[PDB]
Symmetry: D3
Subunit: 267 residues, 6 copies
């Protein structure tokens, strides 16, 4: 095959439409179960709150995996990490109900101390093999200037575990105990700076904010002076791109493009 095609532009198009069968018109259409992976309690809400509701409404079962416990996120000398993490499990539960979310896996790695290792991959893979989701959502680990290791690591570990979920020699005790390999249908990266599919959340904006604000520990009135406009600015950045007021941007690519693809950046 492909001995025929004449330009690169030509082969690239044929590969996308015909070989890979991939398009960006309604990438989430047929998902009946998806998992949203967040580094810290509040990240799903913030990165894709509107889309989670949208999917919630269409009847999609939306599941969280939360990588860390949020231990470090207070400036109050009187709040111990253990208590803040107690507080933040409730904030998250409360936030996910607003968004239609009923299941949350807590891995309970400590905030700022999320390892990048096989051990974590095995955590993610166990849950992916158990639940068999059609879709996985995670942070874009390639986001420029992203300076939180827990965020970078969560992106990389998400993509990797999605891929290694199909591989029966990866974490082989799972297979030995009933958990078969699983091939996730797609991946979508939020908190991305090269979105390629964008979702209209203009009519969910206000709900999204309410779901974000239920993380009270994290957004006091003084923090909210800064963050509400930040959040609106981000949502506008994404919206302006499909000509609407508030958007949530995602990056989706054929599985193949995640590996040895010198033209992954064209889509």
């Amino acid at each position: 095959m492909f001995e025929n095609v004449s330009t690169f532009e030509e082969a690239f198009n044929k590969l996308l439409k015909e070989v890979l069968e991939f398009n960006l018109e309604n990438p989430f259409e047929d998902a009946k179960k998806v998992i949203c992976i967040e580094p810290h309690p509040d990240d799903c809400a913030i990165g894709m709150g509107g889309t989670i509701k949208k999917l919630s409404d269409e009847g999609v079962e939306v599941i969280y995996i939360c990588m860390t416990d949020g231990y470090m996120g207070t400036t109050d000398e009187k709040l111990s990490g253990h208590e803040l993490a107690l507080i933040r499990r409730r904030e998250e539960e409360e936030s996910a109900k607003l968004l239609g979310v009923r299941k949350i896996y807590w891995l309970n790695y400590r905030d700022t101390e999320l390892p990048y290792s096989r051990e974590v991959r095995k955590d993610l893979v166990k849950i992916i093999r158990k639940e068999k989701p059609d879709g996985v959502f995670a942070p874009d680990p390639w986001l420029p200037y992203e300076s939180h290791p827990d965020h970078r690591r969560t992106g990389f570990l998400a993509i990797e575990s999605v891929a290694f979920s199909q591989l029966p020699n990866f974490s082989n005790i799972d297979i030995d105990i009933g958990l078969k390999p699983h091939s996730v249908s797609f991946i979508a990266l939020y908190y991305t700076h090269k979105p390629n599919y964008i979702v209209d959340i203009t009519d969910l904006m206000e709900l999204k904010l309410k779901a974000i604000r239920a993380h009270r520990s994290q957004f006091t009135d003084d923090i909210w002076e800064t963050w509400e406009p930040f959040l609106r600015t981000v949502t506008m950045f994404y919206g302006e791109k499909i000509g609407v007021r508030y958007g949530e941007g995602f990056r989706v690519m054929p599985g193949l493009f995640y590996h040895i693809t010198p033209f992954a950046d064209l889509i």
Copy 2:
């Protein structure tokens, strides 16, 4: 807030001007103490020495933290790394003297073995909590084609530790022994390929090249024949941008932009 603005561009401008209060006019003016982080003995001077002189002239206290010991930087099969490190400590003390630098914290990690971990984070956090600096300076860890692990790691660990210095649950024994949280005012990344603030160093250029030359173990006469050109070529690169002879570039962003900010790259 920001419910009344039509465009992303106006939200962007509003965010930086009204909500953040961020300009590139004289980012360093209010500085009475700064810490300049370098991976190896000689990096403050090579990337930032001109600017260090200038800040010193104003009576801004300049404290160095040096990550490693330089143990590896020689091709001489009869120099042992121990001897090399001893030397480069003296060489750095000279250089530092020329620039009005009178405090060096040596972390003593071995050259090419600087770790990326919480441990080294606590070192930087301990030293930030005690000197309470206004500014910290560090390499840009996203510098393209940067192949030295010590350089990437210091850039990241430097940015993270500025953030984590503010958190009392992080490295919580510091609090316990009377070192309290500290908020740093600015981070300026040097060795950057996306500077947004330039400093004129045309006059002080020769005192920079002598601060550098004092690293005699590194800059032998033969090797000054490759490096002098290279060093002047880098100073022009930054210079051209504000129309002077010799410049040193820095990237400075609001702290918010180091996290989840997909248009971080527009400043």
Copy 3:
């Protein structure tokens, strides 16, 4: 020196041709012996197998280092990783014979578990010092969207060990046993999205393909329907850049550009 030059652009042009005597015309010119470092069995052949016959042909001796054993690359519940690794070693001997490669170093780190550590650098440096190669080939670790850690790590470890191979205090027991430091002449990165030297492989394409196809375990008929077009599309992407139908890309820079070079993107 370089006190006479008037613009950055001039200094840059002068630094390149006069100081570093750097050209893209033929970099693989004087190569007597070269090392191709691959992350898995099959990468040398997929990324640069055309250039590898083109190198053999001119009597350049080509040596593989394979970082991993490729233990995880199958969806077949039948095949244990141990058996796969075996099958794959055979496939790699067949693939290399076809391309005229008569030496392969197997590090045997397990697939998906290749460490990023000093210990792996010592392996590469041991091989490097021993074979004293003029040329080293390795994956671009900065290929965007590259999601295999083993790939990223192979690229970074390769460049760092080329550099560290020159340092006597580095892995100092190699010296005390009769391996002297060694300076490689060039590094070329393959699997790159920013090549700056292309090799015409139009005549050899069916050869590269057959050698790729020799890794049967990886390329079944049903997978070949996707990968053949992918493969052809990649070489087309490289061709168009120099006018021919099929090419293989490489990026090559002056040694100096791998460190603190804010203008390294300009080649």
Copy 4:
């Protein structure tokens, strides 16, 4: 011995009488392929005949156990896997979980605890057997680590906050009834294996890669000598020995050496 005797008989209710009798499912942990056969083949066989389900966990692949330069470690691990399957068949074992850590590189870490605990919660065994990590002069890291990790994992399998995703996917806590340590120099229960010794040796010889005729010249003496060491202690010819203690004597018990 006024307080000691009473704690042991009226609070923890423990004895060296017949501790295995209650069992239905036991797990036998070996560092490498052959260690169960070597360390407790006689008892495995016994238990198997008496109706007990015996499952193996092998920590490593045995990748390193050859002096032949022509044999790659991947081949050897394949070989050694068919040797253990052959060896275990002889002894009536039917499931072997393979961890596949590389021989010589068994980590000592939470991650390995999590494999052990996942299987223990899965299999709900009454008993677990493991090497005594206190065997004086034991110089193999894989051996010491297997012992420690086995004991730790047994203790943590019961704790809902340890490896908590197991819970969330339906593998509940489990409480093993006893731990038995083989390859121990301080045994407090011996098992008669004179009836079963040639079979043991045959289950042992099934690891052909390991026991050539040349090596067997050195090891059949070694192994006959070991099982006399234990058997003598109860005045029979051939025994395999075990250390069993009540769960509590593995923690802050300064008198644990008196049993």
Copy 5:
């Protein structure tokens, strides 16, 4: 010493004249001591007896707790974070009863205490800060001890005590004004090799309460197993020096913690 007869003579002269080592009341001169425990409740269980007796005699007693106790529950409905908050509360109530008013909390998670330079720097930081006279810890060589946190605490405590004296160890401490400190003595509790016992039958009852303040750790149902276990543990030590209830420690010349092949003779 190039003059003594048998090794037996030289031994006693080394103890007696060079190191001036004796066990009559090694705790006699102590103004400030650190007690290091792997998990909250360990100081109490193993040595609350002595802790009371020392707050009394004017000793400022400082706890270091290595972990947070996150794991020590069988209740499926208690999250690890809740447990830790509770045990922190329980420990403050147990510290109160014993005359302790300062606990450093390292906060490494239960079952995940690292054996590393990093943890050493944390002990060394607190030791250089408080310049204490003696440190207490678990004996890391306690036979059959199966809990990694307990062993590691014993090993790291002794190492950090020795490394505290070294200015090139964690040099940044010095650089910011935490200077080297030499501890005067170490004493290991939770030991099967005690060489000094403390009489605590006067306080055994207070001790038992200070332990019970760890409600999460001790149901009424579980106290059925554990109090007789503690009573039996207190006898082993109690008999050795004459009395009904005892607390054992092992104490050595500092020299004995290195390359000392006769160490078990004391």
Copy 6:
């Protein structure tokens, strides 16, 4: 082997006839040995007497030094890089005295010796290169030994000796001309379980001189404690074969380093 009656008979026949193991003179056939030390001075202190004896007799003696001694000082004005420069010179002197031809410096930082495969690869690489007949290292089971570097040195040493024969172990050595090697004996010094003692009564004075050559460790002051200690150490070993000054070693047949429940009987 079915012909035996008691374990004791079994044990003696395995020892004399199967293993060919005796301790009458374990070092007699040595043409080259490696002595592995955690820090500079440990070879001298532990077995310097026996090293002299071995050099005198024509045996090529090699050191491997695990670490650089960077931490060993109280002087808040002496940096660790300096100390290591200084300590290496101090080692070169010491060695000259015992007739030691050669030192490998591994240069891991004092107090930071890793316990990992990486360090085994270092030792395996020097063992395969030198093909020594005997390897000496500290006994890692020395009771109360509290220095991580000494424990880890002993363990890595024994393990690397065994792994040195395994061609799949550190496989790039084989591919570069470094074949496996099978060492003849291991001897453990700093042991509390010697089974062979060398009489060093004669060479005792030169040993304290080879030791004092490490000026940085052994000021006159500290020496007022250490001459006694060292003399007491040599007597403990001496007074077991009834001589004045001894150096002790533990030697066991290779087989006893693995799954051997009666190993403490030899």
